[PDB]
Amino acid sequence: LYALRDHLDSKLVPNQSTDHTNVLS
Amino acid sequence: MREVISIHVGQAGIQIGNACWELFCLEHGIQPDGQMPDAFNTFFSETGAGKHVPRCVFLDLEPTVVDEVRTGTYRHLFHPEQLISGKEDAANNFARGHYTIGKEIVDLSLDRIRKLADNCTGLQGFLMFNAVGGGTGSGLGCLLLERLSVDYGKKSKLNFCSWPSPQVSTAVVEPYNSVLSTHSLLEHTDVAVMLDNEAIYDICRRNLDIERPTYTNLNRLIAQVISSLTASLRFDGALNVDVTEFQTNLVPYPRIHFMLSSYAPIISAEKAYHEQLSVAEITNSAFEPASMMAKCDPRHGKYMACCLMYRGDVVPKDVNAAVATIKTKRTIQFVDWCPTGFKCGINYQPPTVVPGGDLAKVMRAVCMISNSTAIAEVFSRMDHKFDLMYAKRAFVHWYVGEGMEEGEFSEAREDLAALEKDYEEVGI
Amino acid sequence: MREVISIHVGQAGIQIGNACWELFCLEHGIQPDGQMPDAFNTFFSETGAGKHVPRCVFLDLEPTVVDEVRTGTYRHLFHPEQLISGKEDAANNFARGHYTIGKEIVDLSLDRIRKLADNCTGLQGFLMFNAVGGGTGSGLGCLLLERLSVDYGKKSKLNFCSWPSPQVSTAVVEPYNSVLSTHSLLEHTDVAVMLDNEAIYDICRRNLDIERPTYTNLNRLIAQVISSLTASLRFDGALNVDVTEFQTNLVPYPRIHFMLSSYAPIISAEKAYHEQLSVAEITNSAFEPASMMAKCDPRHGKYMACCLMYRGDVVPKDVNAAVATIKTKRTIQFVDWCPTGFKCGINYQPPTVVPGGDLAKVMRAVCMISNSTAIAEVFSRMDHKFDLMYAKRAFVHWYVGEGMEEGEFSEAREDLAALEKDYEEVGI
Amino acid sequence: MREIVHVQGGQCGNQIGAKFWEVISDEHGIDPTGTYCGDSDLQLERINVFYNEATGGRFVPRAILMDLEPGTMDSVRAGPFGQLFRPDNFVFGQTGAGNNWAKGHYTEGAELIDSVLDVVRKEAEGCDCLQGFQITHSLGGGTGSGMGTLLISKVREEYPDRIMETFSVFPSPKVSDTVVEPYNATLSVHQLVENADEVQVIDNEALYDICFRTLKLTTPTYGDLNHLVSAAMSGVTCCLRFPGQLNSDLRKLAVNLIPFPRLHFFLIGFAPLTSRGSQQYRALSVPELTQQMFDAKNMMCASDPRHGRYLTASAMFRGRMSTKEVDEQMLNVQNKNSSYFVEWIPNNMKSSVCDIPPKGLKMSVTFVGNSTAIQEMFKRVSDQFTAMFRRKAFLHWYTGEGMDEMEFTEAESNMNDLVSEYQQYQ
Amino acid sequence: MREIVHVQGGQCGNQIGAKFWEVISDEHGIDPTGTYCGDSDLQLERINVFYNEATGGRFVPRAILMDLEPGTMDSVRAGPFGQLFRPDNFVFGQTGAGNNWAKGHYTEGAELIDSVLDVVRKEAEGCDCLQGFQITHSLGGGTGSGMGTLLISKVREEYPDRIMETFSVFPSPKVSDTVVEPYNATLSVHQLVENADEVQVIDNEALYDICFRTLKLTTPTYGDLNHLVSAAMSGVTCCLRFPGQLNSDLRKLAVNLIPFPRLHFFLIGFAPLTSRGSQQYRALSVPELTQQMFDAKNMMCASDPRHGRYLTASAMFRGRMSTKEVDEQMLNVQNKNSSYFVEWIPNNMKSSVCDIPPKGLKMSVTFVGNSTAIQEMFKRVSDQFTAMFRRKAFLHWYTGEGMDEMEFTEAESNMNDLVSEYQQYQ
Ligand SMILES: Nc1nc2c(ncn2[C@@H]2O[C@H](COP(=O)(O)OP(=O)(O)OP(=O)(O)O)[C@@H](O)[C@H]2O)c(=O)[nH]1
Ligand SMILES: Nc1nc2c(ncn2[C@@H]2O[C@H](COP(=O)(O)OP(=O)(O)OP(=O)(O)O)[C@@H](O)[C@H]2O)c(=O)[nH]1
Ligand SMILES: Nc1nc2c(ncn2[C@@H]2O[C@H](COP(=O)(O)OP(=O)(O)O)[C@@H](O)[C@H]2O)c(=O)[nH]1
Ligand SMILES: Nc1nc2c(ncn2[C@@H]2O[C@H](COP(=O)(O)OP(=O)(O)O)[C@@H](O)[C@H]2O)c(=O)[nH]1
Ligand SMILES: [Mg+2]
Ligand SMILES: [Mg+2]
Structure with a gap:
């Protein structure tokens, strides 16, 4: 039914789900 | 258990009809014979062994538009008995399309739609499609609407009428037809949407970089608006805004039920390459004061209640951000007795594009229907277009010559004046 | 994230931006289609799956150059609605570009820069490339500052002006356009520099040792000095300062915002061979009075504030050593009330070289913007040329009958003259 | 034992309760097919607090899906864990209360209220002695705020002491x-104050503040949005379903949180809430969790x-943690924020410890608070209400269904009295 | 224990904390991945002095890196060892105060200051009693000198006794x-003199002067100047974390170096600072290192x-030393260089021997000297200010955004009385 608006961007623990500089040494 | 009956009356009613059904057929994946190679139950039936017949009726007193689709490509797509061809045209007469030859054809129309209504219980409303500037589209549509109010008095009616334009006219007696029609349209339509033709013309200019097309994408652009409005009925969505709530959600008073509409993006392949189409700017272009299909500048108009259907890969979160910038920006004035006035209905399915058409494939699109006091200036230039035609009784001689009584035009003018003063007291 | 929008008024402004945007395409590695094979976000937006579009608008009244950009190889690099063209030339008239044939195109270009600005938050300002003597570059330039200043009242503006040059002028009525342009340029821009044409012509005559270049050879130098100015906004550096710091470090009074510019080195393939381009060498050469980009000798003037942008493999010690030797030198004179007149920003990413142009691959380079009291004689000769031309109505009759009254000419006279008295009173 | 019967109403409610x-x-160990795995007593x-044995070895939840739009529980069936509910607990709707409190309470409020009360009794007296009724619904929708509210009326008039x-x-x-x-909210809040023992307040964009600042989320979803309200929804009753050192009850909270019978609106928070940049270097200790109940950005409600x-x-x-710096951590937060607490109640804060942590974690806490911050939301819907009555709009389609002008006026005579008894106590 | 809460303001402050x-x-033996190695008690x-346990065994710095431009701490995070800080302690500005004292302190930075105040008291109150706050910044730029002293100003009121x-x-x-x-320097120093208990003066080309003349560095970058001052912070707080024969802390320095409260501006030397050509040629003992300490060529303030x-x-x-020679080697520098010391304080001294040196070295020294040599620096930033100010230089931005002419006049009065007091004590 295309549950994209319920597509989990979280896991079992609450949180969420997984998605230069030249240093002068 | 969930459906809508569509009625297409008038010459422009048929042409907006076959554009809507060519779009819905390729949207459902059904074929011009009726069968695929439960979303279809809101616009079609079953014809036995897996086929589908549309829930429509086509009505026109003049036959060359009805037999045109009877001979064309959607011959056996439609059931051949609601293609109600008349005998002779009303010839830009409200009076002829309502009094002389209407009574021999509304008996056939109401008997057909009686059988169309009883195919399923749980009907949601009606889809009127007509042009009000002409004779048989306005007159026979008004006659058929009055029978619908006295028979199905508890059901919504969703009129989609092509109101005449300030410049593009292609008739003469449009002030006579539209002023006479809109009184009996007012107390018999539950919910109605204005469409001025040249407003589609200029947004074809700036958004589609086409210089001058014909009526075919006049009607395809409007058909995408119809598809996006009823996609909450049809397809599964995140937040569904059905017709039975959309009727009672935008309309604040029993008489102010005339609304504008806009659609964004209507963008060709010229510039779909060049900008992203995300909610933060599609809503801005939808509220852009030259993008509606009515040519009613709302900068001196005054907003009251708006309805937005986001279709595609749309999250409510950037919807909330995009509507917040509409609220905070000063150029759009919402009325001082309605701070929040917004709908955000979300559908998962992206809008479909006709093959070989001038539209381009977009991820997301917003359909707008909004109530504003701007529309008082639309009906006031009908007042100025009509009052000096009626000043010394031009073209009335055959309006009354068929059997209509002089003086009902002037009480209709009292009804238009009652409508203008209503829009002034709303905004104050 | 953060972005800055460029605007290009006049043929000279669009041709400056033409070499600018082909240089930025090399710098960020994008092809002319816009699609790469996040440092580009200050000049390019996003589009689709990998395309970028510049935040630029190409505004002329003549279509012979704007349509020629559309027809050329950089067609789909720009969004087609960002290139706005008119109908007919201003034709070296400040009256036409500001009053008569400007009102139908300022409102259209304002819409395009509106839709280009609300895409993201974090804007620093605007970069307006324009000429002065041209009718379009002064006329639409004046009205664009007038509209952008009153609604974007807290955002910076960068008027890069191609001021008329001393020996050659290649125009007749251009002293009229220059005084009228500064009538409104003073109260509406934030940072402006003068880029005189024969100062640049002299640069490419004794640094490139080419004696008949073209317009594109100068526009490569202007592209290089804009790229070296805004390289802090794009590439990470040890000491980075950008548009906000320019508006607060180089313009100590609100009404002195006229600066010079220079670059170092500007060397050909054979001249890169025979010297190492040390930091101290490319600061002495940038501070050479013959190296300035406005025919504006600082030998008989006093420096007021200075800013240098070191790009490439520059080290933070010899930026201090080159500044120290400049302080010790007596030929360069400073102002008494500014003991610490030096600002700089160092960057790592060296200036790129166009393959087939005229520059050479350099390890390091210096950009320059310096405010001084030496622009007093630059505008005092625009005073003198305007005197004997405005003695007895030279070409005045077509500015006064075509949009303005007589008296705006006189008002522009004390507006530029009060800038001369402002330049005199600061030094003393 | 004691069993909580769950009623789930509205489009918003049927997605909240589905999560x-x-x-x-999945924290009790039940697969969506109904079986168990987890080998823990x-x-x-x-498990009878929320489930029922089906004499097939599976557990059917004591939930009542109820709605007047037939697409909401259609998505519940299609979704994951969508084969737990009995189809007989489902009651459908076809005419649809279209974002309308009036037609959802009276017109189609009659032919479905007889059936959803049939389904609740044979889920009620079928047990030995029930305990309570949890109801997930919305005050913004039409059938979530009208049709579910008539259910609140009919449940209490049968069961007045639970x-x-x-x-x-x-x-x-x-x-x-x-x-x-404001039409849907305030016509429902009269029935909420006279006919409900607790009402816990959730704001949608306060939850947006949770995912924006304390979660660092770019584009979260209703799955996550209902997940962080179902963490506290789990936490209010997990101490009932599980043992603990100092156990607790819904009525245990009720007696010593509601002072006086008409104010029972609660302020629900949950801790901890981490990002990728808030999980690795962060100590998970009780003094670190003390500040996350008393953090306005960690609040699921708009009331500051x-x-x-x-x-x-x-x-x-919840978790393996000592019970005492529950309480001197609640003592020092009371002592430093003395001006943030009421003065005429000594030792305001209640503490309870459940000996089962949330699954996958080591420690959490679910905050419930009766506070005089809640009048911010109660006065904005109040004066959004008063702008819709001095010119009579949008309610003529309430009067056409029976909702005449009489009851709207004392819907405000009890609403401003509700906030007057709020402010007269500070 | 005693804990230091570190705050870095500006691009200079973030880089100087990024060394x-x-x-x-590495003095604590901590990997960039936060894991200890070194098997030493x-x-x-x-380690709680500068770090907090994360209930994972890994230690997070108690720092708050903060300014108004995102390019500074993105380069810190991308650089080595920059992962140790929280993105929670990182606070972001996007528009940026560009070399502007006024809009850093009043308009822009005050918008950000209510959220970086949240993260500084969380690192402060999270322990039982803090020792103090360490704030590193520069007086030249806008965000590090204008709003950098705004947080110096406000931490005075809620935390006065620390x-x-x-x-x-x-x-x-x-x-x-x-x-x-001088507009940034003098307008910051008045808030920096009645809201800071002790301030150390570091000058840029004096860091260069140590590089070219005593370290013989052919190529010093900003990182080479940054090591010189990073050794100065490491020595001054070494005895807090690491034992010694004679203890010393921040208040140990404060009560012995300030006799009069309006003067707390300190010179810093660091020894040994060897040119590596003669690193293998230089003996390392107290009687050779004390005159490297008392030396103008080893001064990272450019005042003779x-x-x-x-x-x-x-x-x-610092180091394995002899704590007799800790003190007659500075007895020697007092009774020979008699004129280089004040007369009405006999016995001007404090040695503070700390047992553990930096790694490899057997001896090291940071030197804190409260002297009237900084008079030349305060006079020089004064006449550079007043030569500009007499002709209204670069000021219309400062006045137009929330300041006026009056505030700059007492900025020079409490600049000038610092010089007038140092001549009273001369
Ligand atoms: N949307 C739309 N409007 C049209 C089209 N063709 C004509 N119209 C408008 O319809 C108005 C008149 O109505 P008609 O299209 O002639 O149809 P009618 O009202 O039934 O009148 P008849 O010609 O007698 O059938 C004109 O003023 C046109 O502006 C069309 O193809 N699409
Ligand atoms: N540096 C530089 N200067 C140019 C260029 N093109 C034109 N100019 C200058 O512009 C002046 C001519 O006027 P234009 O700027 O072309 O006039 P305009 O802005 O197009 O205004 P209209 O001619 O009315 O359209 C000459 O004096 C040139 O010095 C260019 O490509 N580079
Ligand atoms: N948290 C949450 N809020 C929701 C959800 N669905 C809808 N809402 C909110 O509920 C409001 C609309 O209520 P609605 O679902 O139409 O109630 P209904 O009339 O009973 O269908 C919107 O303002 C949403 O913010 C959901 O799944 N989760
Ligand atoms: N010690 C040190 N000084 C620096 C560094 N970068 C710049 N400076 C000095 O500080 C001044 C610029 O200060 P800046 O960091 O821009 O201050 P801000 O604008 O408030 O962040 C320059 O004059 C430099 O001399 C650095 O990395 N380390
Ligand atoms: Mg026709
Ligand atoms: Mg031109």
Whole structure:
């Protein structure tokens, strides 16, 4: 039914789900 | 258990009809014979062994538009008995399309739609499609609407009428037809949407970089608006805004039920390459004061209640951000007795594009229907277009010559004046 | 994230931006289609799956150059609605570009820069490339500052002006356009520099040792000095300062915002061979009075504030050593009330070289913007040329009958003259 | 034992409670097919609080899906864990209460209220002695706020002494859909104050503040949005389903959080809440969790606690942790924020510890607070209401269904009296 | 225990903490991945001073890196060892205050200051009692000098009884960047003198002067100047975390170096600072390192101490030493260089021997000397201010955004009374 608006961007623990500089040494 | 009956009356009613059904057929994946190679139950039936017949009726007193689709490509797509061809045209007469030859054809129309209504219980409303500037589209549509109010008095009616334009006219007696029609349209339509033709013309200019097309994408652009409005009925969505709530959600008073509409993006392949189409700017272009299909500048108009259907890969979160910038920006004035006035209905399915058409494939699109006091200036230039035609009784001689009584035009003018003063007291 | 929008008024402004945007395409590695094979976000937006579009608008009244950009190889690099063209030339008239044939195109270009600005938050300002003597570059330039200043009242503006040059002028009525342009340029821009044409012509005559270049050879130098100015906004550096710091470090009074510019080195393939381009060498050469980009000798003037942008493999010690030797030198004179007149920003990413142009691959380079009291004689000769031309109505009759009254000419006279008295009173 | 019967109403409610059963079933060890895995007696010794044996070895939740739009529970069936509910608990709707409180309470409020009350009794007296009624619904929708509210009336008039609570969401201050928000909210809050033991307040964009600042989320979803309200929804009753050192009850909270019978609106928070940049270097200790109940950005409700004083706060800790710096951590937060607490109640804060942590974690806490911050939301819907009556609009289609002008006026005579008894106590 | 809460303001402050945290982490034996290695009790014996446990065994710095431009801490995070800090302690500005004192302090930075105040009291109150706050910044730019002293100003009021440790990088005399140097420097120093308990003066070309003349560095970058001051922070707080024969802390320095409260501006030397050609040629003992300490060529303030008298002096000795020679080697420098010390304080001294040196070295020293040599620096930033100010220089931005002419006049009165007091004590 295309549950994209319920597509989990979280896991079992609450949180969420997984998605230069030249240093002068 | 969930459906809508569509009625297409008038010459422009048929042409907006076959554009809507060519779009819905390729949207459902059904074929011009009726069968695929439960979303279809809101616009079609079953014809036995897996086929589908549309829930429509086509009505026109003049036959060359009805037999045109009877001979064309959607011959056996439609059931051949609601293609109600008349005998002779009303010839830009409200009076002829309502009094002389209407009574021999509304008996056939109401008997057909009686059988169309009883195919399923749980009907949601009606889809009127007509042009009000002409004779048989306005007159026979008004006659058929009055029978619908006295028979199905508890059901919504969703009129989609092509109101005449300030410049593009292609008739003469449009002030006579539209002023006479809109009184009996007012107390018999539950919910109605204005469409001025040249407003589609200029947004074809700036958004589609086409210089001058014909009526075919006049009607395809409007058909995408119809598809996006009823996609909450049809397809599964995140937040569904059905017709039975959309009727009672935008309309604040029993008489102010005339609304504008806009659609964004209507963008060709010229510039779909060049900008992203995300909610933060599609809503801005939808509220852009030259993008509606009515040519009613709302900068001196005054907003009251708006309805937005986001279709595609749309999250409510950037919807909330995009509507917040509409609220905070000063150029759009919402009325001082309605701070929040917004709908955000979300559908998962992206809008479909006709093959070989001038539209381009977009991820997301917003359909707008909004109530504003701007529309008082639309009906006031009908007042100025009509009052000096009626000043010394031009073209009335055959309006009354068929059997209509002089003086009902002037009480209709009292009804238009009652409508203008209503829009002034709303905004104050 | 953060972005800055460029605007290009006049043929000279669009041709400056033409070499600018082909240089930025090399710098960020994008092809002319816009699609790469996040440092580009200050000049390019996003589009689709990998395309970028510049935040630029190409505004002329003549279509012979704007349509020629559309027809050329950089067609789909720009969004087609960002290139706005008119109908007919201003034709070296400040009256036409500001009053008569400007009102139908300022409102259209304002819409395009509106839709280009609300895409993201974090804007620093605007970069307006324009000429002065041209009718379009002064006329639409004046009205664009007038509209952008009153609604974007807290955002910076960068008027890069191609001021008329001393020996050659290649125009007749251009002293009229220059005084009228500064009538409104003073109260509406934030940072402006003068880029005189024969100062640049002299640069490419004794640094490139080419004696008949073209317009594109100068526009490569202007592209290089804009790229070296805004390289802090794009590439990470040890000491980075950008548009906000320019508006607060180089313009100590609100009404002195006229600066010079220079670059170092500007060397050909054979001249890169025979010297190492040390930091101290490319600061002495940038501070050479013959190296300035406005025919504006600082030998008989006093420096007021200075800013240098070191790009490439520059080290933070010899930026201090080159500044120290400049302080010790007596030929360069400073102002008494500014003991610490030096600002700089160092960057790592060296200036790129166009393959087939005229520059050479350099390890390091210096950009320059310096405010001084030496622009007093630059505008005092625009005073003198305007005197004997405005003695007895030279070409005045077509500015006064075509949009303005007589008296705006006189008002522009004390507006530029009060800038001369402002330049005199600061030094003393 | 004692069993909580769950009623789930509205489009918003049927998605909230679906994630509620998606988070309770997988923390109790039940697969979506109904079987069990997890080989622990702690997950099974009290499973009758929410489930029922089906004499096939599976557990069917004691949930009642109820709605007047037939697409909402259509998505529940298609979704994951969508084969737990009995089809006989489902009651459908075809005419649809279209974002309309009036037609959802009376016109189609009659032919479905007889059936959803049939289904609740044979889920009620079929047990030995029930305990309470949890109801997830919305005050912004039409059938979530009207049709579910008539259910609140009919349950209490049969069962007048049992506890019941509503995890209700509220209309939005900033970005508002379903434009008759004060109409739906305030006609329902009269029935909420006279006919409900607890009402816990959730704001949609306050949850947006949770995912924006304390979660660092770019584009979260209703799955996550209902997940962080089902964490506290789990936490209010997990101490009932599980043992602990100092156990607790819904009525245990009720007696010592509600001071006086008409104010029972609660302020629900949950801790901890981490990002990728808030999980690795962060100590998970009780003094670190003390500040996350008393953090306005960690609040699921729009009411800013700094603009009020907590009448009575309570916390439901979970995990392997000592019970005492529950309480001197609640003592020093009371002592430093003395001006943030009411003065005429000594030792305002309640503490309780459950000996089962949330699954996958080591420690959490669910905050419930009766506070005088809540009047911010109660006065914006009040004066959004008063702008819709001095010119009579949008209610003529309420009067056409029976909702005449009489009851709207005392809907405000009890609403401003509700906030007057709030402010007269500070 | 005693804990330091570190705050870094500005691009200078974030880079100077992007070298100090490295030189203090490897002193504690901490990997960039936060895991300890080194099997020593003494490194972990006081790690709570500058770090907090994360309930994972890994230690997070108690720093708050903060300014108004995102390019500074993105380069810190991308650089080595920059992962140790929280993105929660990182606070972001997007528009940026560009070399502007006024809009850093009043308009822009005050918008950000209510959220970075949240993260600084969380690192403050999270322990039982803090020792003090260490704030490193520069007095030349906008965000590090204008709003950098705003947080110096406000931490005075809620935390008055605890010490205020600050490093400030003063403007350079002969070659200075950031054209408005004295407007940022003098308008910051008045808030920096009644809201900071002790301030250390570091000058940019004096760091260069140590590089070219004593280190013989052919190629010094900003990282080479940054090591010189990172060793100065490491020595001054070494005895807090690491034991010794004679203890010393921040208040130990404060009560012995300030006799009069309006003067707390300190000179810093660091020894040994060897050119590596003669590193293998130089003996390492107390009687050779003390005259490297008392030396103008080893001064990271560009003031010759021979143009003044040492009011008070101190030395944080470090290493396996002899704590007799800790003190007659500075007895020698007092009774020979008699004129270089003040007369009405007999016995101007404090040695503070700390047992554990930096790794490899057997001896090291940071030197804190409160002297009237800084008179030349305060006069020089004064006449550079007043030559500009007499002709209204670069000021219409400052006045137009929330300041006026009046505030700059007492900015020079409490600049000038610092010089007038140092001549009273001369
Ligand atoms: N949307 C739309 N409007 C049209 C089209 N063709 C004509 N119209 C408008 O319709 C108005 C008149 O109505 P008609 O299209 O002639 O149809 P009618 O009202 O039934 O009148 P008849 O010609 O007698 O059938 C004109 O003023 C046109 O502006 C069309 O193809 N699409
Ligand atoms: N540096 C530089 N200067 C140019 C260029 N093109 C034109 N100019 C200058 O512009 C002046 C001519 O006027 P234009 O700027 O072309 O006039 P305009 O802005 O197009 O205004 P209209 O001619 O009315 O359209 C000459 O004096 C040139 O110095 C160019 O490509 N580079
Ligand atoms: N948290 C949450 N809020 C929701 C959800 N669905 C809808 N809402 C909110 O509820 C309001 C609309 O209520 P609605 O679902 O139409 O109630 P209904 O009339 O009973 O269908 C909107 O303002 C949304 O913010 C959901 O799944 N989760
Ligand atoms: N010690 C040190 N000084 C620096 C560094 N970068 C710049 N400076 C000095 O500080 C001045 C610029 O200060 P800046 O960091 O821009 O201050 P801000 O604008 O407030 O962040 C320049 O004049 C430099 O001399 C650095 O990395 N380390
Ligand atoms: Mg026709
Ligand atoms: Mg031109």
